[PDB]
Design a protein around this nucleic acid. Sequence first.
RNA 1: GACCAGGCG
Lengths: 65, 283, 258, 94, 48, 54, 76, 152
Amino acid sequence: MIVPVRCFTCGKVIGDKYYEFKRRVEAGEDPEKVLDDLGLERYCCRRMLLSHVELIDDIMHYRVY
Amino acid sequence: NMEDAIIINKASIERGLARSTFFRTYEAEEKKYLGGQTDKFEIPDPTVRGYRGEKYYRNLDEDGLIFPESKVEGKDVLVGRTSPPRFLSLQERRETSVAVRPSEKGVVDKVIITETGDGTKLVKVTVRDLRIPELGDKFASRHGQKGVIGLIVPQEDMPWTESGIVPDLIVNPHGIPSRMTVGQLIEAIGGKVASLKGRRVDGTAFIGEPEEKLRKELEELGFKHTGREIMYDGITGKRLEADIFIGVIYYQRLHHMVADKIHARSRGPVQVLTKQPTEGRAR
Amino acid sequence: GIEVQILEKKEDSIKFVLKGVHVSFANALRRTILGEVPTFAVDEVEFYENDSALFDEIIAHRLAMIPLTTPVDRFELDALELDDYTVTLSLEAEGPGIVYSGDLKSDDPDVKPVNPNIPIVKLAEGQRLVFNAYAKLGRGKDHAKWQPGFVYYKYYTIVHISKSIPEWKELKKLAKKRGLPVEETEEEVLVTTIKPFYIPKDFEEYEGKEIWEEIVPNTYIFTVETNGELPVEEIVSIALKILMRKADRFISELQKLT
Amino acid sequence: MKIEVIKKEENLLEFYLEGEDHTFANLLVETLRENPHVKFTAYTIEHPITMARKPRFRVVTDGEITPEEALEEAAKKIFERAKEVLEAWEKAVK
Amino acid sequence: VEAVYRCFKCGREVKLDLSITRDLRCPYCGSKILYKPRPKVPRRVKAI
Amino acid sequence: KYTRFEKARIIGARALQISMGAPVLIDVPPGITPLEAAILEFEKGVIPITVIRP
Amino acid sequence: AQRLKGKEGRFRGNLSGKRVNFSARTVISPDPMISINEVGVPVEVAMELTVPEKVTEFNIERLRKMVLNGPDKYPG
Amino acid sequence: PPYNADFDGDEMNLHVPQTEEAQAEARILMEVQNHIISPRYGGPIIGGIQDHISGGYLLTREGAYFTRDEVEQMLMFAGVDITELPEPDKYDENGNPLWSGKTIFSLLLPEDLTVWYRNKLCDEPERCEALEKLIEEKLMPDPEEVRKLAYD
RNA sequence: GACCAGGCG
Ligand SMILES: [Mg+2]
Ligand SMILES: [Zn+2]
Ligand SMILES: [Zn+2]
């Protein structure tokens, strides 16, 4: 649905740095350099951002009251 | 984790891994009978026949419908309905309310009121239940390897690689040679390489990236081409004698949960014809 | 004797070398840091009206995952029975937009979210979300939401490379590129394993006989990082104090047996 | 932490340790193994689910000293080097 | 017994009694489907 | 000398007898289920029942 | 004629095999820490199935203790 | 093995006898330890499986050796009643005593057992012939001579 | 209660 707050394996907080990564990778930058700049060294954390889908935005159209 | 059993980390579960929710819908109708006889939505009086305990009619509004977002246990009543009296009992309405299944639990999610195609009223109620992984739940990859959770381990007891990685899952090496699923190892290497490189890996059948290219890329990135690493024992605190294969593998959670299979009977209803116990978990 | 030296002290991570202790002590310290150090975290949420696209439990879990600051002086963070002081957090949002973690008002100024940029939920037009949250002290061994950070270690080894290998310069250049310290002597090149160093494929033939690893006894390279809840040195000191308190209580209980 | 004695005879002592896990037990037994008057010592967890917090200990000594004083001496040693490590860390961190 | 209800597709409040009402329809929309709104009570949920 | 079928039948008969009022021929620790008492009686060799064999 | 023949007839359907009362069913998981002649039982099932017992002079105390716990505490 | 079960989604049923006669019959006639031998071919049916063989090979192979803490921990974990470690077999550097895998495994066998045969790992049959000859000539060979001519 | 369809070992 929405970006997880913490990496599952090691608990590092990565929930606040998804939008910056998406924007800088849509701006034509090298994804590896962007991930290195953001400070994610262990690949257990890179796996979280590299493979996420924002499915929240296309389910708010249906309201249940 | 012997005989196709798997071991899962606890802290990973506590952080939202493989969490899911279960839904179920109940239906009630205010039917019309031959003549002036009809059903009614109403909180039953203590006088009527078959009147359950007053504890069950706990969170029913005076119109006969349950308030949304209220906790419900087994045998709790969702919609209160009183049928016309059954001819032999005169002047005694029959209680035929709709109740939650005797072995379920959840929270009411939504209530809908509408009218059927011939004028009768109709209500539909849904129940939401949260389910966390436990013992007996079935996990399975896409290469044909299936199993159930055998044990849940605290984080500090799991081994860790010398580069700072803690496994999220443990699989027995005895299950690999007999099934001959080399694609799982290929996928593990490719997934680790893809996660390191920041770009997804193509594996489309006969056109995907060859194995040797992935191994060479993994060697370039700093790790070992065999895919092995050095780990330290989580209890004793010293490294094991052998390098351990480790990677990233896609996994799926099937819908054969243990919470829908447990069943036990001591005494209950019996068949009318043969006076033997009934058939089915549902009854 | 026992001594400690520092190798890197960046903002929220410290790497140091621990020398002169047995493996059991290091593993005990790691486990104590991972499990016993207390921290504030959300434990119960009361909802008044929630019209978002997410159920109550998902929002409660997301709130529980947010790190919180923890004062050091006020409470006893090394006692074996923790206090039950409760801090209440409140929120009220409406209309379109993202409800960031920086919109939480706290009764006690010492307990606030560390990072005010974590999204919580996305709201559409006409929706509302009002609730109250309660936070309390806890331990890592009970739930993963109370963990202060992440700790691991490794042995301290020196890799010897004989100069009889015709292309040792490539290995030396690779070691320099990785960043490991390198000392060169006659007919031998010494590499210090501050970070893991895996031999490439081409040189695997010589490994074992001409490339061998030497392990320095009783030396480990620790690594501690935090999410901002507590400073790292405070974490280490609290863990050591907890170990001492456990030892003292065991001594007393054993003494009263006889 | 409660101590529950199971069997006490001659130089052998065997007891539970309620409210504890691998963290303290492994350190205690490793500290004990350094004593030259301890002939056999070990610990185990009987079941990871039902008894995850009740390690079982066995201490057998030569007979020069009783098991209880050996346990006390071993427990006193941890309190010393832990304090030394704390002092060194607090000196080095600044 | 008067209760509040909300239209399925318009969202605007409809006020009627189910006991004697012979047809269910929003006075604003042709729809015959209605919701039952949530009560105003401080529900308490654990954070585990 | 007993065949295992005879042993099982004898133990079952004695266990049924004890649970109806028959006194126990040996001392037993408290809380013991009647079947265990019958088993203890059998292994102590004091069972009075005998089997007739054609 | 049809009630007496086939795999659902009165002979092979009810007389030879029939549904029983005290039984339970669930999934299995490995456990190597118990001896080979033991089995693990969930506390939910153990509180449903019951074993009748006759009170005697050597088990009156335990039975009286069990009755006091009622049907909702485990030993009861 | 006797159940032919595998932990991948299998289910099993459980029945509880109610009368004392039924309980006695189940206790005396239907015990698990009474069915180790299979009636079809007169051989063991309940035994080791999967890791129970690989671990045994790792323990009893040639060159396996263990330190004091590992030996004490494994013996305590297994449940063996021991209060004194046997004599060490060889000394590592810095004089650390070491015990072999065979010495550890011998602590489980009964005291008066004696048997010999050939297992699946036989590659060169010209080396087992010498051991068979030595056993045949003298019915109780000197343990040093056997240990000098050991073979997997 | 009987039928039909689909799954699990
Ligand atoms: Mg199977
Ligand atoms: Zn991570
Ligand atoms: Zn409308």
